[PDB]
Amino acid sequence: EVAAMDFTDKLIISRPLYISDNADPKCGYCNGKKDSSHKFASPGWSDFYKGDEDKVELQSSTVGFNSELVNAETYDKLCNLGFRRSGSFMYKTDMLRNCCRLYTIRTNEKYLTMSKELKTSLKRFKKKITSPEFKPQPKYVSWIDELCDYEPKSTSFKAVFEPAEFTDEKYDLYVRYQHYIHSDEDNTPSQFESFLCDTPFTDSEITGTEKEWEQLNNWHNLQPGERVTKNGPAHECYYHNGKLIALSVLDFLPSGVSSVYFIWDPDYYDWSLGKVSALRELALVSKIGRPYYYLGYYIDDCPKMNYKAKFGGEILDVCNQKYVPLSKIHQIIKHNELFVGLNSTVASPDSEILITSDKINFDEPFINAVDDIYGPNGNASQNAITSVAKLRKYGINYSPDLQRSIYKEIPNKDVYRIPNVVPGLVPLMEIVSLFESGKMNELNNNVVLFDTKINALRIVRDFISEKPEIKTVITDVIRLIGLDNTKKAIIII
C-alpha cells in the first residue's frame, strides 16, 4: 500500500503565464507615464537611454498561475517569494521590465513609528466611538493596549470577523467605494465574488468552526503568549449603529496577516478608516502573537501605494530571498530603481545570485549591485543563453533572448514564454545545476499532473521521459516557486 493522496498538503495550479503589454493603459499605477528619471530600472539603463528616453515604450508585465487549491502555509511561502493573490490567481510583476518597481513589504508594531499623523487618526476614531463616561487607565504600555480597552466598550461601534462570504450589503458598499475611487472595472456581483469572497483555500481555512471565529472575535482580550488557530481568508465587518461602514478582506497566515483589500463608506471620510484599519490590523497581528503584517506591494513613486511606508517595515529582495529594512534603502529606490543587494566585502558578482550558500547580511554594509548583474553591460544574459543550450539537451523548450535591450524600443506574443532572466525566478544556470546533479529526480513519485487529455491525475514516475511540453511547464513552475514547493504540486496541463 501507499498513502492516499493528501489534499491538505497539495498546491493545485494551472500552467504559468507571462503577460506583457503597453503600460499605457495596462498599468493602473502609472498609466505608462513616468518622469524620465523614474523610467528605467537602474542608472545603467538610464544612461543607456540618456537623451532618448522617449523612444522606449514602457511595458507592464506579470507572471503567475491560477490556483485551484492552496493551503495557508503554502500561500505564506508564495507571499515571501514576492507573489500576491488576485482572487485565485497568484502573480507577480517582472521587476526588471515592468514600468513600476513593486516591492513586497511587511511590518509590525516593533517597526511602526506612531507619528502625530497616525496618533491623530486613532484619537479621532476613539472620539467617534467612545462614550464620555469611559475612564481610561492611567497608563497603557502600548497604543495597542489603549485601543483594546476602549474599542470593545463602545456601544455604537462593532467590528466582526466572519467567513469571506458574499452579502448584498457588502456588495452595495463595494460598488459605492469603487466608484468613489474611480475604479475602471466592471464591479459586478460575480466580479466582487471572485475577487473578494471565493478563494482557493481549504474548506477548513474558509469556513472554520464556530469556536474558531468566536476566539478570533475575542482578540482584543488576548493575553501575552496566547495564540489563535485561525488561518486562511476572512472578512472583518465594521458596523456603526448596525450599519456596515467598512469591510476589510484579510488572509491569516502562519507568519501574520495579509491585507487583501479595504473598502469603506465614502460618507465616513472623516473617520480616517484607511489609516485606522491598518493600525487595528497591526494591533491584531501583535495580539495574536504573529510576527508580520503584509500590506502587499510598495511602489515608492505611487501615492496610492507609498502610504504603506508610513507603517514602516522591510522590503523583500527577491534576488537574495531576504528582507532589508526600508529605512536603509529608501534613499536609493526613490527613482523607481530595482535593488539587488550585495555585501560590500564581496567580489563583484559574476552571475545572477544563486538561489541554492553564504546569504547576504543586511546588518553589514552593502551596495546595490543591480547593474553588475542586470544592467546593459551586466553578465546575466550571457550566462542565460549558455544555459538555454544545455537545457535544450534535456528536452526543455526554452529559446535564447538575443535582443540588446530589455526595453521595447520604437521599431524605427507567446503567453507561455518566460524571459530567460527575471529577478526572483530561479536563474537558468541554477536550473542547469539541478539537472546535472540529478536533483531533478526528486520530482519522481512526487510531482503530480492533471492531464486534461485523459482527464485524470497522474503521478510523474520518470520526469526525463515526459514530453518536452510537459517538462518545460514543470521547469517553469520550478523557476517560479522552487523545487521543494513543486514536489507538492498538482499541475494542470
Could you tell me which residues are annotated as the binding site for Zn(2+)? Answer: 27, 30, 99-100
30-38, 81-89, 120-128, 197-205 -> range binding Zn ion (CB under 5 A): 30-38
Q: Minimum CB separation from Zn ion for residue 238, in Å?
A: 31
CA pair distance 75, 201, nearest whole angstrom? 9
CA distance linking residue 468 with residue 462, whole number of Å: 13
Closer residue to Zn ion (CB): 34 or 230? 34
**30 versus 282: smaller Cβ distance to Zn ion:** 30
Q: Which of 145, 109, 114, 149 lies closest to 129 in space, CA to CA?
A: 149
Pick the closer one to Zn ion by CB: 61 or 272: 61
Q: Which of the ranges 28-36, 107-115, 334-342, 468-476 carries the binding residues for Zn ion, by CB under 5 A? A: 28-36
For residue 25, whether the previous peptide bond is cis, meaning omega lies within 30 degrees of 0, is yes
Residues 75-104 that bind Zn ion (CB under 5 A): 99-100
Q: How far is the CB of 307 from Zn ion (least distance, A)?
A: 17
Kindly determine how many residues on this chain lie close enough to bind Zn ion according to the rule CB under 5 A. Answer: 6
Nearer to Zn ion, 23 or 319 (CB): 23
Nearest residue (CB) to Zn ion, 100 versus 278: 100
Give the annotated binding-site residues. Answer: 27, 30, 99-100
Over its C-alpha atoms, the chain yields an Rg (Å, rounded) of 24
Residue 160 beta carbon to Zn ion: minimum distance, rounded to whole angstroms: 36
**Shortest CB 105 distance to Zn ion, Å:** 17
Nearer to Zn ion, 31 or 397 (CB): 31
Of 336 and 472, which has the nearer Cβ to Zn ion? 336
Query: Is residue 30 close enough to count as binding Zn ion by CB under 5 A?
Result: yes
Interface map 6-25 toward Zn ion (x if CB under 5 A)? -----------------x--
Minimum distance from CB of 422 to Zn ion (Å)?
17
Cβ proximity to Zn ion: between 95 and 489 the closer is 95
Shortest Å distance, C-beta 183 to Zn ion: 17
| Residue 257 makes contact with Zn ion by CB under 5 A | no
Q: Which residue in the set 12, 13, 27, 481 belongs to the binding site for Zn ion (CB under 5 A)?
A: 27
Question: Residue 17 Cβ, how far from Zn ion at the closest point, in Å?
Answer: 19
Question: Is 305 one of the binding residues for Zn ion (CB under 5 A)?
Answer: no
Window contacting Zn ion (CB under 5 A); options: 1-9, 29-37, 181-189, 248-256: 29-37
* Interhelix angle 380-393/428-436, nearest 10 degrees: 40
Q: Determine, following the binding rule CB under 5 A, whether residue 29 of this chain makes contact with Zn ion.
A: yes
Closest separation in Å from C-beta 98 to Zn ion: 7
Chain center to CA of 77: 10
Q: Does 422 bind Zn ion (CB under 5 A)?
A: no
- The site for Zn ion (CB under 5 A) is made up of 23, 27, 29-30, 99-100
